[PDB]
Each structure stands twice: as structure tokens, then as C-alpha cells.
Amino acid sequence: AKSKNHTAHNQTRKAHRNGIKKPKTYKYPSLKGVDPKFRRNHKHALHGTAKALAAAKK
């Protein structure tokens, strides 16, 4: 008893009936996957600038 193997009919309609939107862009992107040294110095730079801002403006 043979049967259907593959069919692309109605897949486009099935998926497209629910609205497909662009991925919600984030003003602060995920930083995962970058070179480790960039993180190791970025954290120090952020700490330094935060402490400088705290000392300057309270």
C-alpha cells in the first residue's frame, strides 16, 4: 500500500495564516559569543565609568 512521500502544498498557507513578524529588535543586543578579552576589559571599563559617574554625580 503506497502512500504520499512529501508535499509542500498548503504549508505556505498554514504557516502564513499566523502573522510572521521580524524578530523583536533589542536596543541592547545579547553579547554572548564575542572574544573573551573584549568582555574582560569591557566589564572593567564599565565598572570604572560607573564609579567615576557615581563620584561625580550623586
Binding site: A15, I20, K21, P29, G33, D35
Partner: protein
């Protein structure tokens, strides 16, 4: 059986353009690569280390990572019914600068200059771009251009 590999059905994809064989010209390597810049992808078959997949060919994305010799590009993929980002790394070869970002930059620079020199006076700045409006009225004079009759050519064997 079945064949769906990393380089399946790419006989003409990873093929060097005619009269462009040999080593890669030494100008794409010295381009300064940053983060947040709009850029596209075009694979090169000269080096067999770090090629983009068949889908990623001809796709444009934003750079997020920089390394010794590699870039990180965000590419949206269509599977199912959802847009999802994908982080991918290629060598400095198969990554070509896109002129759309440069066009946007020069347009915004010109717009800022025009806005400044207009607000200096404030008269019909017309900052927005206009599409191809229909042509206005025109006058055609038949001086030396008298129309001549056109007749269909009879069928010729």
C-alpha cells in the same frame, strides 16, 4: 540513497568567476571592519576554511564580533513560521561591504546640511523624498520634424 551535505548542489555556487582565478586581490583584507555596520556575504572558493552555507550566500547581516581573522554576522533564517537570528563566523574573505549603508549615510548627511541651511531662513525645506511624479505639460514644435506616415510592413518570406 540521498545526498544533503554541507556543499550539496553547489556546482556553480562555489565556482570562481571566469578570468578571476588565482589568488585573491589584496584590497578586501585591509578594509576596517566594525560592529553595527550593514554588510553582505559572498563566498569565495579560493580558501577552503570557513565558508558560509548555501543559504547564507548572497545574504546581508550586521556585524557583532571581531577577531584576529574572522567576523560575526547576524543572519535571519526562514524555517517554520518564525524569524530567528543566527550567529555565524566566516573568514575575512567571504564578507563584502554593502553600499546601502553608505547611501543612507550620505543621504542623512545631505539632509542635515539642507535642514541647517533651510532653517537658516525657514522657507519650504521639503525634507521628505518624493517618488516619480507624473510628467507635467509640454510643448512640441514640428519645426524640421514634420511627422511622416507609418505603415505596417507586408509579410516577407
Amino acid at each position: 540513497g540521498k545526498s544533503h551535505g554541507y556543499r550539496s548542489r553547489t556546482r556553480y555556487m562555489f565556482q570562481r568567476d571566469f578570468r578571476k582565478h588565482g589568488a585573491v586581490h589584496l584590497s578586501t583584507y585591509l578594509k576596517v571592519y566594525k560592529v553595527g555596520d550593514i554588510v553582505d556575504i559572498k563566498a569565495n572558493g579560493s580558501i577552503q576554511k570557513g565558508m558560509p552555507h548555501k543559504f547564507y550566500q548572497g545574504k546581508t547581516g550586521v556585524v557583532y564580533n571581531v577577531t584576529k581573522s574572522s567576523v560575526g554576522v547576524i543572519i535571519n533564517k526562514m524555517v517554520g513560521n518564525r524569524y530567528l537570528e543566527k550567529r555565524l563566523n566566516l573568514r575575512v574573505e567571504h564578507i563584502k561591504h554593502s553600499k546601502c549603508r553608505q547611501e543612507f549615510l550620505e543621504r542623512v548627511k545631505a539632509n542635515a546640511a539642507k535642514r541647517a541651511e533651510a532653517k537658516a531662513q525657514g522657507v519650504a525645506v521639503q525634507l521628505k523624498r518624493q517618488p516619480a511624479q507624473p510628467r507635467e505639460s509640454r510643448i512640441v514644435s514640428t519645426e524640421g520634424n514634420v511627422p511622416q506616415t507609418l505603415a505596417p510592413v507586408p509579410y516577407e518570406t
